[PDB]
Amino acid sequence: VAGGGVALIRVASKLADLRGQNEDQNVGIKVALRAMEAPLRQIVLNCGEEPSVVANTVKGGDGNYGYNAATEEYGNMIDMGILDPTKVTRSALQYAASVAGLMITTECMVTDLPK
Amino acid sequence: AAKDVKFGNDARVKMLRGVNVLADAVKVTLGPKGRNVVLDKSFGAPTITKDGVSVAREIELEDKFENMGAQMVKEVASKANDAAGDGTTTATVLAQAIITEGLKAVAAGMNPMDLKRGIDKAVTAAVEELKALSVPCSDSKAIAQVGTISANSDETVGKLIAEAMDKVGKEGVITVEDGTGLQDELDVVEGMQFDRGYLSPYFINKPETGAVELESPFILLADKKISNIREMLPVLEAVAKAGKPLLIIAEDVEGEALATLVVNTMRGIVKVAAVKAPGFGDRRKAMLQDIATLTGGTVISEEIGMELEKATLEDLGQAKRVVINKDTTTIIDGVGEEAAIQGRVAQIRQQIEEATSDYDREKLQERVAKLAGGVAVIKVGAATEVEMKEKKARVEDALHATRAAVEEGVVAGGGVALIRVASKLADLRGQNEDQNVGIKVALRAMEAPLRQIVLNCGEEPSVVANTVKGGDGNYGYNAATEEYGNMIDMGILDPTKVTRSALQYAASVAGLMITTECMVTDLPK
Amino acid sequence: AAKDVKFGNDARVKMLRGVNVLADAVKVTLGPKGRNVVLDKSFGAPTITKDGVSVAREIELEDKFENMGAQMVKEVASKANDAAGDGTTTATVLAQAIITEGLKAVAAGMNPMDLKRGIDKAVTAAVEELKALSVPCSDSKAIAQVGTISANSDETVGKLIAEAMDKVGKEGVITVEDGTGLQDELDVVEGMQFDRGYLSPYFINKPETGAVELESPFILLADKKISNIREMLPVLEAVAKAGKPLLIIAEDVEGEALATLVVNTMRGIVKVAAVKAPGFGDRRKAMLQDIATLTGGTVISEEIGMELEKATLEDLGQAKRVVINKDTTTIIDGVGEEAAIQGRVAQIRQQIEEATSDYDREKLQERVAKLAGGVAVIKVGAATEVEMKEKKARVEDALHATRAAVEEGVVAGGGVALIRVASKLADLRGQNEDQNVGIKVALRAMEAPLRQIVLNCGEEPSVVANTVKGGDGNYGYNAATEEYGNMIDMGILDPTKVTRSALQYAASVAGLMITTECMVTDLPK
Amino acid sequence: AAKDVKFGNDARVKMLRGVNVLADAVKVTLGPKGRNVVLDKSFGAPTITKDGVSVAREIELEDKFENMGAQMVKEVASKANDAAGDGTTTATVLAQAIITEGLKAVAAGMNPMDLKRGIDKAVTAAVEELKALSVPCSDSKAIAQVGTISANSDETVGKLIAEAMDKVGKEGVITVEDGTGLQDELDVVEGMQFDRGYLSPYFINKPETGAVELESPFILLADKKISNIREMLPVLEAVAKAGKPLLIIAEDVEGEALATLVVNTMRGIVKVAAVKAPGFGDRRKAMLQDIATLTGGTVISEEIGMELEKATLEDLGQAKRVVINKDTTTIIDGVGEEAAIQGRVAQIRQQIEEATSDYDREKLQERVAKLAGGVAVIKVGAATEVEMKEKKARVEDALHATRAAVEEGVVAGGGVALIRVASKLADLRGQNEDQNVGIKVALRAMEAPLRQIVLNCGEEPSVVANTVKGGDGNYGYNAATEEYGNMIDMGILDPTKVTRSALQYAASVAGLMITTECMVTDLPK
Ligand SMILES: [Mg+2]
Ligand SMILES: [Mg+2]
Ligand SMILES: [Mg+2]
Known part of the structure; x- marks a missing residue:
């Protein structure tokens, strides 16, 4: 799939109408969708460009169209040769959401005393 | 230190x-x-x-x-x-x-x-x-539109401002006052405006506009620098009895005299404001006399040998209203006789003919424009007092915006x-x-x-x-x-x-x- | 700072x-x-x-x-x-x-x-x-019920309020006073009420209700802004000798005049209260004359050239009671002759016929309703003074509740x-x-x-x-x-x-x- | 942590x-x-x-x-x-x-x-x-000039370096040693240099040059990675008895073997240094054998089934001096018989004839150049020991300067x-x-x-x-x-x-x- 973090922002854009059983779940959805932009924005931030503007333009397009962070031009990311294995992007998201879900639902922590 | x-x-x-x-x-x-x-x-x-x-x-x-x-x-x-x-x-x-x-x-x-x-x-x-x-703002239609937008999409305000500018012109003087009913009013009266502000920010009695407003004030016309209150006492006591505010227009008020008039107005023993006389040199002396004729007072000039101690409340001119801010002073509805004013105007126009220089003609032409032109007065009307005060504020605010729009677009x-x-x-x-x-x-x-x-x-x-x-x-x-x-x-x-x-x-x-x-x-x- | x-x-x-x-x-x-x-x-x-x-x-x-x-x-x-x-x-x-x-x-x-x-x-x-x-509250049965519930399940209070509103109407003015015995009293007298409150919270002498009560006060009616105490010295001294409290109804009382009156009342050398005159503009001048006829005083307008220094006791109107809170001033039992009031009423009913506008006829209809309508006075009775004061409080409280119930249910x-x-x-x-x-x-x-x-x-x-x-x-x-x-x-x-x-x-x-x-x-x- | x-x-x-x-x-x-x-x-x-x-x-x-x-x-x-x-x-x-x-x-x-x-x-x-x-530095005159300038305007040093470079060429190997008297000496001996430095900076025994200098050392040649010191004990003990230093040239020396050798050298129970064998793969195995023939030792290859425990003193080669820095190892005056070395050279030249690839011929030609070329040895002489050590230092320093000058000017x-x-x-x-x-x-x-x-x-x-x-x-x-x-x-x-x-x-x-x-x-x- 398209690399440079645009695959995650692409699929998040397709899931705007996704809802759950209640309002709390709906927020949980929007939290996840908004988090899927974090990789792209960070890549763009490291380049010294505005994350908001690039994220905005990438959402505008469809498919594997995105922002090549190296050359600072938009186009088909697969064609330009900026890609990731689907397994990588999938795995990264699922593992991220796994630990995030556990931490959000943590009410108690037990550890040894400072000294 | x-x-x-x-x-x-x-x-x-x-x-x-x-x-x-x-x-x-x-x-x-x-x-x-x-x-x-x-x-x-x-x-x-x-x-x-x-x-x-x-x-x-x-x-x-x-x-x-x-x-x-x-x-x-x-x-x-x-x-x-x-x-x-x-x-x-x-x-x-x-x-x-x-x-x-x-x-x-x-x-x-x-x-x-x-x-x-x-x-x-x-x-x-x-x-x-x-x-x-x-984009320029010239025609009356445009003036109304800008006034409307400035007054929170209120067409009545745009119409008021446009009508006022139609009366006295684009370079004219326009005032806003409280209304006396539901109806709005628009009248032109004997008045003048010159580019001299308050001599102390402590004189401000309407802090919203950042201005001093005196209702039915006496106006003192002095052709000297007042540094001491000693010479002001016989005049100040004669206005304190009449129970009306006082505007002083002198060459300058500074030092002891200013400080005392600051603290008196703040305490509220006598409401007083002070501004410099307009212009400088010979033209200042002439313009003081213009205000004298307008207001129906007499200039107290030490050059012909008048002292401020012998001044009486007959000598002071008076108007219906004075409005001073940081830059300008506006005298509204002076009690001057139309005979005296029209006579002064005719006297200036005489000098325009005798003038040798272009500069002299232009200066005399802007004095006649002040006396002849007068001052527009918009009285803003509404159903309730609360609505009237609110609308008045929007009119003053839209007036300033529209004036600026006319100047530069x-x-x-x-x-x-x-x-x-x-x-x-x-x-x-x-x-x-x-x-x-x-x-x-x-x-x-x-x-x-x-x-x-x-x-x-x-x-x-x-x-x-x-x-x-x-x-x-x-x-x-x-x-x-x-x-x-x-x-x-x-x-x-x-x-x-x-x-x-x-x-x-x-x-x-x-x-x-x-x-x-x-x-x-x-x-x- | x-x-x-x-x-x-x-x-x-x-x-x-x-x-x-x-x-x-x-x-x-x-x-x-x-x-x-x-x-x-x-x-x-x-x-x-x-x-x-x-x-x-x-x-x-x-x-x-x-x-x-x-x-x-x-x-x-x-x-x-x-x-x-x-x-x-x-x-x-x-x-x-x-x-x-x-x-x-x-x-x-x-x-x-x-x-x-x-x-x-x-x-x-x-x-x-x-x-x-x-649920609406219209009929006098319902009114009595709401008054009873508001007055802690006391049916006497519900009856009192219902009877009062029966006499002066639903939008009538109703007052509550101390009783002179066991029996309750209800009387309608010459009076008025306008929407202007105290100009200073330091006039409050009944802190429980948050109101100013003046017993047998003189009323000063001035058609100007009072800023200095200098002009009200001859009137204040004339009121001190009579030893009666004073209400001042002016265009506004501000600055040094307000401050001096606030301190004087708190020291207790003269008991005084100040409120703005009702309305604004031309309608204010008219309503200031309405209260003049009601109280039997004369308006001290500076417009026709009257001064506050030449104001004697005979110029002040008087009533039996004035009650002022944050919003309202009520004038109770004026000393105006029936001839003068009934004449003023007939004069306004002349102007309604000659009125061109609907807005003009409704404003004149308000003024006639005030003068003609008068004020209801409930005198709350009880066995002891302690019970009397206690019941009075519940009546005032239930009256406001019932008035509100009538308006919106x-x-x-x-x-x-x-x-x-x-x-x-x-x-x-x-x-x-x-x-x-x-x-x-x-x-x-x-x-x-x-x-x-x-x-x-x-x-x-x-x-x-x-x-x-x-x-x-x-x-x-x-x-x-x-x-x-x-x-x-x-x-x-x-x-x-x-x-x-x-x-x-x-x-x-x-x-x-x-x-x-x-x-x-x-x-x- | x-x-x-x-x-x-x-x-x-x-x-x-x-x-x-x-x-x-x-x-x-x-x-x-x-x-x-x-x-x-x-x-x-x-x-x-x-x-x-x-x-x-x-x-x-x-x-x-x-x-x-x-x-x-x-x-x-x-x-x-x-x-x-x-x-x-x-x-x-x-x-x-x-x-x-x-x-x-x-x-x-x-x-x-x-x-x-x-x-x-x-x-x-x-x-x-x-x-x-x-500016290029090619001709022998220029070599001497740069060497003179580098050696603090000493023309004797410039000549020494020039004469040495004339013997073994511009890309030849040159050593500097202590002199045995007043006269300087220049001799070409059986030696080699390869681009592998010390495996630990704690082997440095000449901290000024930042180099390891072993005098009359034994050289161990192992075609394996040495991780444990257990397999080294029979060889280390044999070396400790002869009371001579040891150079270890292996595929790699790491882990516990390296650590033990570092501590032993710093204690001073056996003076030892370790370097990686030059090159990698098949080319490495060949060059280990080149060093073996040069030093007159035997390669301990586990491939043909030799163990490091059954390695005796005769299996180790020896030279008169080895000098190791961060990048390079130089073996000076090996005890290999002229018959064996010339035989190895002839053997490689045979493989050049049978070589099909040009890359293979160039790599073989490098190995011949090392064995056949040998090493120049400058013995620096002076009147006193103090002057001798001082001059020797300047010669080493000027030699490096001149070598660099030859490469790039x-x-x-x-x-x-x-x-x-x-x-x-x-x-x-x-x-x-x-x-x-x-x-x-x-x-x-x-x-x-x-x-x-x-x-x-x-x-x-x-x-x-x-x-x-x-x-x-x-x-x-x-x-x-x-x-x-x-x-x-x-x-x-x-x-x-x-x-x-x-x-x-x-x-x-x-x-x-x-x-x-x-x-x-x-x-x-
Ligand atoms: Mg503005
Ligand atoms: Mg209540
Ligand atoms: Mg150096």
């Missing part, structure tokens, strides 16, 4: 921390989705306001260096409001932006003087671009005019690299107003700013409705004078602060 | 901490099982009260930001009591609930302005739902009306998700009054709230008897005006506080 | 503080009027040195972030000395200059990556300019070549403004060496720097004599390799440090 002296970077960051407190306090109120500021009053409940000027007045800091920084920007930013009736907040936000990026550059080791000269070059260029972008509001103008000056360069940075500092600072407005709305400043640069002319972002289009058509505009004044004043103080190497103030204790 | 400036979340928590102190102090008194609050005075034993208004006025906090928070809610919550005679405590509890949940949402990163817009939309909807829920009390209306607005939405949260904040806040009442009773708020939502109409939980049923039937009700006013004022200040980004106050020391 | 983590600017100023301590300590020694640094050792009187390398090795800081800054610059600056035999101090002063100005730019808000790319572009360009400015010394090259790159630009600043940072940094030299002399850096830019070519300022002229003619020069290496290594770390956003280190605990 022993002084605390700071230098260089140490001094400049103190100023910057001061300007930040001011700017950050005022800039929250900017735009249609502007936030509230709560101002404390230890005699009742606190004020909740979205007026950036009200907030600015309150700002004073404990650190004396930080305070100096805040007071410098306040001083200059307020001059924008004095000129155009708007854009103190804008001037403050611009100043913050220019100083912040200016000091970054100074720390990067660039010459302050070159930075200043680069900023100034970008501003001169930007002002010319504002002229180009400006209108440009896209919402901070769009500045960002548009800045986008046209990408290729502007200076004498060296340091000046080039000074330019880019200014151009980047011109986005600050828009971005802040967009930030207050809760939208991304960068994205909006980006889209607005894409278009051309008066195309911009309506922050209220969240749609792009022609800003003038959508009715979001500013007088070109406002935007111009805000930028020039902002760049003035910013340039001075960037080129400050030393500060001196009293020590904390 | 140097200021302390706070921003954003840091500022908003301070205000919330402040409102919590106010709300928590006042809300303990809410409901039939309300708790006592002990208020300290350093002249005697401390006061024990269940009056939330008494508690609120005492609350002032040391932290100047926290204080500003408390004073803002006090200011606005008190306007609920001014309008309807109840619901300051309710407004405070609502304000706390809206602010708390509002600020949680702001911290979650939702736009304050949208939250406000959502709250406001929920309120507008809720007010209409209150209109729908409202009655709804289920005990905080049930609010929770009922909130349950009907589950499907209300706004323009975006932020506004939707604003709605849910408001809806959830409307339960706060009920829950607090239930909490004070020692029952579970969530369970009761749950059951009340289950039912429909004016079915609710009687907190006194711990039974469910028709709240109106069980005699637990509020005037619709009270509940409405409390909600709208609560939402007003809450909306402003949520959209506050900056606060400015003096420095701790 | 728990870590201390710093980010962004906070991290980068720490590194700069660390680099400053290093650079400031080392840069005082720079130039002909360089100052002394006193280095404390707690076993005698302190060292007084003008050797910037000696100073650098001592520098270690308490603050762990500052230390990291210093250690990074040390690490790479030392690579300059490894390559060319000079310019660690120059590399350090350059690095300081690039980092200082680089971080000023980063704080001004310029993209670190672009700054780095601008710096790198300026350096690539500057290296090309150095090649253009370079010479350019103007005294920091002139860098300032000259920088002056020719004024019009160099990049892809954006950030890269342009990156270029100007680098060009301005290239002046740092000259300015520091001039500062140490007590003259004004800016004035001298200004004059040197005025001229062209190898015209510059002789800091010793305070005269301008052709720097090469005056005999103030540097090998082009030195100046090139110093600049590239300086820019290497400066680039990495500028583009650092996070640092991780252990806690102060």
Whole structure:
């Protein structure tokens, strides 16, 4: 799939109408969708460009169209040769959401005393 | 007193921390989705306001260096409001932006003087671009539209202002007063206006407008400098008995005399205000006599051998109303006989024929224009007193906006005019690299107003700013409705004078602060 | 002075901490099982009260930001009591609930302005739902019932109020005085009432009601602004000799004149009160002559050339009693000749015939209604003086409740009306998700009054709230008897005006506080 | 262990503080009027040195972030000395200059990556300019001149080096040893040199040159990785009895085997050093056997089934001297019979005939050149032992200088070549403004060496720097004599390799440090 973090922002854009059983779940959805932009924005931030503007333009397009962070031009990311294995992007998201879900639902922590 | 002296970077960051407190306090109120500021009053409940000027007045800091920084920007930013009736907040936000990026550059080791000269070059260029972008406001239809937009989409206000400007002209004098019923009124009366403000800000009795309003006052006409109250006592006691306020127009009031009249008005033993007589030299003496004839008083000139001690309340002229602000004094409805005034006018026109110089003819022509022209008086009517006072305020505010619109036109509001103008000056360069940075500092600072407005709305400043640069002319972002289009058509505009004044004043103080190497103030204790 | 400036979340928590102190102090008194609050005075034993208004006025906090928070809610919550005679405590509890949940949402990163817009939309909807829920109070039977319920199940009070409103009408003026024996009295006399309150809260001599009562006072009628005490010395000295109190009705009393009169009354050398003249412009001059004919005084207009220094006792009008509060001035039993008043009335009924405008005839119809209508005077009787004063208080309190009930009807009390209306607005939405949260904040806040009442009773708020939502109409939980049923039937009700006013004022200040980004106050020391 | 983590600017100023301590300590020694640094050792009187390398090795800081800054610059600056035999101090002063100005730019808000790319572009360009400015050093006359200048104007040293290079060629191997009397000696012996350095810096027994020098050592040749010392014990014990040092040439020596050998050498129970065998794969196996034939030892290959435990003293080869530094190993005067070596050479020349590939022939030709070529040995003679050791040091130092001069030529010394090259790159630009600043940072940094030299002399850096830019070519300022002229003619020069290496290594770390956003280190605990 398209690399440079645009695959995650692409699929998040397709899931705007996704809802759950209640309002709390709906927020949980929007939290996840908004988090899927974090990789792209960070890549763009490291380049010294505005994350908001690039994220905005990438959402505008469809498919594997995105922002090549190296050359600072938009186009088909697969064609330009900026890609990731689907397994990588999938795995990264699922593992991220796994630990995030556990931490959000943590009410108690037990550890040894400072000294 | 022993002084605390700071230098260089140490001094400049103190100023910057001061300007930040001011700017950050005022800039929250900017735009249609502007936030509230709560101002404390230890005699009742606190004020909740979205007026950036009200907030600015309150700002004073404990650190004396930080305070100096805040007071410098306040001083200059307020001059924008004095000129155009708007854009103190804008001037403050611009100043913050220019100083912040200016000091970054100074720390990067660039010459302050070159930075200043680069900023100034970008501003001169930007002002010319504002002229180009400006849509004129000439015909009565347009005057009504601008008055309507300025008065919160109220067509009755636009109509009032247009009718008033039709009576006395575009360069005419227009007053606003309380109405006496539901009906609005428009009358022209014997009056005059000259460019002399109050001689103390402590005389202000209407703090909203920042002006002194005297109802049915006596006017003292002195052709001397009053430094002592000793010579004023027989006159002050004769007006205290008549129980009416007093305007003094002298060559100057200063020293003992000023201080005493400040404290008396504040305590409220006698309501008094003071302004310099208009002009200087021979022409001052002549204009004092013009006001004398208008007001039906006699000038008390020490040159023919009159003393202020022997002055009686017969000598003082009187009008229905006087309004003084920081720059101007307006005398409204003088009690002068039409015989005397028309006689004075005929006497001036005689001198125009005998005048040898062009300069002399022009000066005499602007004296006759004052006497002959008079003063328009808009009485604002409404159903309830609360509605009447509210509408009056909108009329005064719209009047100032429309006056400014007539002078220099209108440009896209919402901070769009500045960002548009800045986008046209990408290729502007200076004498060296340091000046080039000074330019880019200014151009980047011109986005600050828009971005802040967009930030207050809760939208991304960068994205909006980006889209607005894409278009051309008066195309911009309506922050209220969240749609792009022609800003003038959508009715979001500013007088070109406002935007111009805000930028020039902002760049003035910013340039001075960037080129400050030393500060001196009293020590904390 | 140097200021302390706070921003954003840091500022908003301070205000919330402040409102919590106010709300928590006042809300303990809410409901039939309300708790006592002990208020300290350093002249005697401390006061024990269940009056939330008494508690609120005492609350002032040391932290100047926290204080500003408390004073803002006090200011606005008190306007609920001014309008309807109840619901300051309710407004405070609502304000706390809206602010708390509002600020949680702001911290979650939702736009304050949208939250406000959502709250406001929920309120507008809720007010209409209150209109729908409202049971009218028209017939004199119903009036007596509401008066009885308001006066702590005393049927004598209900009868008194019903009989009074039967004589002077529903929109008639009704006064309450001390009785002269066991029997109650009811008399209609020459009188008037206009919407102008005291010009200084320091005139208040009956602090419980928060009102100025003057017994057999002279009334000064001046058609000018009084700024100096110099011009009212001959009149004040003439009033001191007669040893009667003085009411001043002028265009305005401000500055040194106001200050001097405030101090004089507090020292107690002369008892005086000042109010603005009713209306503005030409209509003011007319109404100032109406009170002149009623009292049997003459207006001291400077327009036809009369001075205040040449005003004797005979120029002042007089009445048997004047009652002034924050909004209203009532003139009771004037000494005007029936000939003069009936003549003035006939004169105005002449002008109604010659009136061209509908607006002119309705304004003249107001003035005739005041002069012709007069004022009802209830003299409350009892066995002892202690019982008499106690009953009088309940009559005044029930009178305001009944007046409000006549205007807008009655709804289920005990905080049930609010929770009922909130349950009907589950499907209300706004323009975006932020506004939707604003709605849910408001809806959830409307339960706060009920829950607090239930909490004070020692029952579970969530369970009761749950059951009340289950039912429909004016079915609710009687907190006194711990039974469910028709709240109106069980005699637990509020005037619709009270509940409405409390909600709208609560939402007003809450909306402003949520959209506050900056606060400015003096420095701790 | 728990870590201390710093980010962004906070991290980068720490590194700069660390680099400053290093650079400031080392840069005082720079130039002909360089100052002394006193280095404390707690076993005698302190060292007084003008050797910037000696100073650098001592520098270690308490603050762990500052230390990291210093250690990074040390690490790479030392690579300059490894390559060319000079310019660690120059590399350090350059690095300081690039980092200082680089971080000023980063704080001004310029993209670190672009700054780095601008710096790198300026350096690539500057290296090309150095090649253009370079005067070749080819003929034997020039060899002697450079050797003389490098050996402190001693013509005997220049001749010695020239005569040595005449014997074994320009790409020949040359050693320097202690003399046995007054006369100098030059002999060519059976030896070899390969590009593998010590496997631990703790093997260094000559800390001044930073080298391992073993006298009459045994050489162990193992075709395996040695991880455990257990397999080494029978060989180590046999060597301890003969009482001679041991060189281990294996595939690799790591883990417990390395650690044990490090501790044993530092204790001094057996003096031992370890290096990797040259090359990799099949080429490695062949070259191990080349060393075996040369030293007259046997390769212990586990491939054909030999164990290291059954290795006796006869299996080890021996030479008269081995010299190992960070990059190179030189085996001097092996005890291999001339029959066996010439036989091995003849055997390889046979394989050249049978070789099909050109790559194979070139690789075989390298191996023949090593075996057949041998090693030149200069024995330096003098009257006293003190004079002999002193001259020997100057010869070693001049030899490295001359070798470098032969490879890439010479350019103007005294920091002139860098300032000259920088002056020719004024019009160099990049892809954006950030890269342009990156270029100007680098060009301005290239002046740092000259300015520091001039500062140490007590003259004004800016004035001298200004004059040197005025001229062209190898015209510059002789800091010793305070005269301008052709720097090469005056005999103030540097090998082009030195100046090139110093600049590239300086820019290497400066680039990495500028583009650092996070640092991780252990806690102060
Ligand atoms: Mg304005
Ligand atoms: Mg009440
Ligand atoms: Mg060397």
